[PDB]
Design a protein around this ligand. Structure first.
Ligand SMILES: [Mg+2]
Ligand SMILES: [Mg+2]
Ligand SMILES: [Mg+2]
Ligand SMILES: [Mg+2]
Lengths: 165, 68, 159, 285, 49
RNA sequence: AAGCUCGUAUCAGUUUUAUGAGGUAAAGCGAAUGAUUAGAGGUUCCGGGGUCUUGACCUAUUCUCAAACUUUAAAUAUGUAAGAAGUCCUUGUUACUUAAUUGAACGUGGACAUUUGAAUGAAGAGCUUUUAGUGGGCCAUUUUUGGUAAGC
RNA sequence: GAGAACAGAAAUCUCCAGUAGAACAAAAGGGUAAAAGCCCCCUUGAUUUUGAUUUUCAGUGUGAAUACAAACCAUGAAAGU
RNA sequence: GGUUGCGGCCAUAUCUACCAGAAAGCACCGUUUCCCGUCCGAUCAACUGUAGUUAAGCUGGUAAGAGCCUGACCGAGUAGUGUAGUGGGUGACCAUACGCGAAACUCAGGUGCUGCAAUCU
């Protein structure tokens, strides 16, 4: 009655190799694709193999909530043609997938911007998840109220009319 | 017994050879081990054995030691 | 060379008890100390301020001064062939009330009560403690308790 | 979890495990200057739950905390306020109630009357020359986050206006802008008499009507418009200053009658004899 | 042990004193055990001493 | 050595009663950390040969250890207390403290005698001035470091 | 540990478990989890005047440290520090 | 007796897996004009108690549960140790005399108690 699955948030991640004009150019698309200003991430350490160093500002990402996240998810599922493997589903009830280009969603090519891929990840939960997030009397979710892999897969099949390999 | 006697010459000081009343390398007496084995309280794991206690969950002590 | 720092050789003395780390319970800060109280010293390792020197660990003294968060304690220290008085400024976390005399006050109260009740009736109030006395004569019965004979056991190995 | 992990685990304090008490803040709130001996320190405990506000005056003891006076927002309907028992103006009324109630019990209600001409002016309770000093309490917000315009400082404003001496600054009241170092008395006065709720009712009604019926439905049923709650808050303040004494709600049933009802729905533990029977029966199954 | 012997007034060999038997005095006797001989006097022994 | 102030007075290389402090001996490793023997049952789209072995881990066990490891933890040594400078009742002082004669400290006045607050002892207790020599040590039982050991 | 285009043992993103097995300029030992760690905001008390106390100790000095008094400040809604 | 606010001792209170919960309370939950804070009204802030739900939190119970606590002439007066001898033994070490006295192990029982204020078949 009050344990219906729902989308907590949708985070879009673009892992850029380096910083500079390349990273901020990739940050441009997320501004109008999600209607929110994204945030950038800096590398934890230095490898000297992938081409990054400490605090090099290598990545950019943004998360969205509400029905707008569902609209972006719908437009992102057209690339996969409502088809995902048996994988991509976590044991905690979350699922995600990645794409190779962003223009297919409807974004104009804009040679001044270029071509980028994106990572989509969806976090599923049930009403009452505030108990783990609230400051006072912070607690844990009961076992029967937790989201499992099977429940998310079944929920993913009843809607979107999609199939799992 | 003769094998341990020959080993004494390699050691300084005095050593004694004692026939233990335990069953092998277990800490149970010779007749006590017979009682537990015939009651189905002994299970073999590798070269040693595991015993059954009166403690713990029944669902774990029933799958093990089915004979008891 | 040798090392004689302030907290030398205090590896175990200033440790917390097992499964007793963390913050101090509030009853430590709610106790009231007044000049003349007898207190004992036990340093708390989690409070680095107002910490007594390792010599005074386990010593008992008398409060002579009370401050905002600390008290002043009088300690007699044996130096050479004489005793010298030492004054310590210690925070309340490192001290507690001494029970060596709280029980003595109870006997003082009890002596007066027994002194007063005997004042009207009986002479020889007898308000002095005595050590343990030798046992008096008694009779031991064997009804259902017949003595059982014991003997030394022979030597065995059972290894 | 392994057996070694459980054996070496140190459990926090019970109040810390439940997540209600901040012991870092409590130590500094409760500890008293040791040269003041048994002088109590009084906290103004203000806690906000759903559809309820609680205000208490509490001192500390070894056995436990002791309540000197208490006030609840659900007692407001006896003074005039029946809607919005958790808003900013409700906190002000509850804060005023606990201030007047505490002073009357101590006997200092004639002195330190407070202010009866509130207009959002920041001022402390000054002591009277050649007379007793005002009763002093310290605000205890618990785990509440300090933000300007929050309701917890609304109860602070009411208690200070009620005659109690509470030390505070004005930079956390509504109407303070970080750009300049001053307060706006007009905006603060608006929040005291529910100005922020009145403006919403006017604007919500002129924007959509299905929401103005879903919300504020109690106001429409009892015939209160958006320019009348100004007076009822003023009437409530005068009523509180008239009879601030506490009157308990009449008990329909006695305590022992309540106990008999509750024991019927409470499950009891088993004896050691019947625990052994369950094991024996389970073995034979 | 030297201090206990002084407190019992035994400062030279073949000296003797009477001691009341309590818990406070039985612990004194155990400290000087390898230096003294003691027992339970009789009436004749006390009279002749 | 010279004494001085006093003389029942408090003291004591001691015990007892009450109440503290400690991390050594021992003990422990299917308790943490670090060493360490042996198999057993599982686990890989994630080591490597080979169509099934050897390593890695995980689970329940097993043998043996620690001056610079430890949950537990002695014996012997060690702090304080056992009253007149004490306990109880009433109320005087203050610029300190309290919302407040509230509290804190120091007092006035009244009551309680030496089975007056455990044991034993007490060539009396307390105190001051001044100055000599000495400032190479060594031996024994027990504890113990370096060293094969030493009358080291 | 389970998940996400390039992406792999190690790039970034998400969830779960996690008594500290991390971190706290340095040697080592203590101490610390709504913190003493990480990030952010505001600051100069790392200030003025002289005494008492602890450690080494002759109860000298030096070094270091502890608790107050009388001022003047910083921070916070505040108790406080 | 149930519940809430503030606590005291800080596992008999923790952890794992299940089950139950009348009334009130608590909670989840609804909304974004205003104060306020964010990449995101998720956290934080404000507004309504209205649209809903006991699903979770929460409380209680169950388990030859893990852990924890208490006790025992359980192990054990064992290990260790103060004191003594012109005691034993080449030695290493050990026995006895007067005293003190463990830990592991085994077994049994237990699974929060309680102070202040308010409220409820
Ligand atoms: Mg705080
Ligand atoms: Mg040591
Ligand atoms: Mg040892
Ligand atoms: Mg001799």
């Amino acid at each position: 009655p009050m344990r219906d699955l729902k989308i907590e948030k949708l985070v879009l991640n673009i892992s850029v190799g380096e910083s500079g004009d390349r990273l901020t150019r990739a940050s441009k698309v997320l501004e109008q694709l999600s209607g929110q200003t994204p945030v950038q991430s800096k590398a934890r350490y230095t490898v000297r193999t992938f081409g990054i160093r400490r605090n090099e500002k290598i990545a950019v990402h943004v998360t969205v909530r509400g029905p707008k996240a569902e609209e972006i998810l719908e437009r992102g599922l057209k690339v996969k043609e409502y088809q995902l493997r048996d994988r991509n589903f976590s044991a905690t009830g979350n699922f995600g997938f990645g794409i190779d280009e962003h223009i297919d969603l409807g974004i104009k090519y804009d040679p001044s911007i270029g071509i980028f891929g994106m990572d989509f990840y969806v976090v599923m939960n049930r009403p009452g998840a505030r108990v783990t997030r609230r400051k006072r009397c912070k607690g844990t979710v009961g076992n029967s109220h937790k989201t499992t892999k099977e429940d998310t897969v079944s929920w993913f099949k009843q809607k979107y009319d999609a199939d799992v390999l | 017994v003769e094998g341990l006697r020959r080993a004494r010459y390699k050691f300084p000081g005095q050593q004694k050879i004692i026939l233990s009343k335990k069953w092998g390398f277990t800490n149970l007496d010779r007749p006590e081990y017979l009682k537990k084995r015939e009651a189905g309280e002994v299970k073999d794991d590798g070269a040693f054995v595991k015993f059954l206690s009166k403690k713990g969950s029944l669902e774990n002590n029933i799958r093990e030691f089915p004979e008891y | 060379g040798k090392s004689h720092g302030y907290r030398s050789r205090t590896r175990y003395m200033f440790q917390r008890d097992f499964r007793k780390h963390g913050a101090v319970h509030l009853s430590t800060y709610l106790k009231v100390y007044k000049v003349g109280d007898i207190v004992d010293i036990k340093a708390n390792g989690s409070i680095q301020k107002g910490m007594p020197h390792k010599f005074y660990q386990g010593k008992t003294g008398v409060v002579y001064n009370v401050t905002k968060s600390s008290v002043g304690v009088i300690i007699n220290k044996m130096v050479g062939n004489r005793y010298l008085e030492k004054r310590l400024n210690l925070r309340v976390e490192h001290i507690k009330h001494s029970k060596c005399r709280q029980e003595f006050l109870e006997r003082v109260k009890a002596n007066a009560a027994k002194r007063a009740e005997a004042k009207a009736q009986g002479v020889a109030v007898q308000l002095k403690r005595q050590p343990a006395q030798p046992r008096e004569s008694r009779i031991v019965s064997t009804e259902g308790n017949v003595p059982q004979t014991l003997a030394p056991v022979p030597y065995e190995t059972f290894i | 979890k392994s057996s070694a992990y459980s054996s070496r685990f140190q459990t926090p304090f019970r109040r810390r495990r439940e997540g209600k008490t901040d012991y870092y803040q409590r130590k500094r709130l409760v500890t008293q200057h040791k040269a003041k001996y048994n002088t109590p320190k009084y906290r103004l405990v203000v806690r906000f739950t759903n559809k309820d506000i609680i205000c208490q005056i509490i001192s500390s003891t070894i056995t436990g905390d002791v309540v000197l006076a208490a006030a609840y927002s659900h007692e407001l309907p006896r003074y005039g306020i029946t809607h919005g028992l958790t808003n900013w103006a409700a906190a002000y009324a509850t804060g005023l109630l606990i201030a007047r109630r505490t002073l009357q019990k101590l006997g200092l209600d004639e002195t330190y009357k407070g202010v009866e001409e509130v207009e959002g002016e920041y001022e402390l309770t000054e002591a009277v020359e050649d007379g007793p000093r005002p009763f002093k309490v310290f605000l205890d917000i618990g785990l509440q986050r300090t933000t300007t315009g929050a309701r917890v400082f609304g109860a602070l404003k009411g208690a200070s206006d009620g005659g109690l001496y509470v030390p505070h600054s004005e930079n956390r009241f509504p109407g303070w802008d970080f750009e300049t170092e001053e307060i706006d008395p007009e905006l603060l006065r608006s929040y005291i008499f529910g100005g922020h709720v009145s403006q919403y009712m006017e604007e919500l009604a002129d924007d959509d009507e299905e929401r103005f019926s879903e919300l504020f439905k109690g106001y429409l049923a009892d015939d209160i418009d958006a320019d009348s709650l100004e007076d009822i808050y003023t009437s409530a303040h005068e009523a509180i200053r008239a009879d601030p004494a506490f009157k308990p709600t009449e008990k329909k049933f006695t305590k022992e009658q309540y106990a008999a009802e509750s024991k019927k729905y409470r499950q009891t533990k088993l004896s050691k004899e019947e625990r052994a029977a369950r094991v024996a029966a389970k073995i034979a199954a | 042990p030297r201090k206990v012997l002084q407190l019992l007034r035994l400062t030279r060999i073949n000296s003797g004193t009477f001691v009341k038997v309590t818990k406070a005095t039985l612990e004194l006797l155990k400290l000087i055990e390898p230096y003294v001989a003691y027992g339970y006097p009789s009436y004749s022994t006390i009279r002749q001493l």
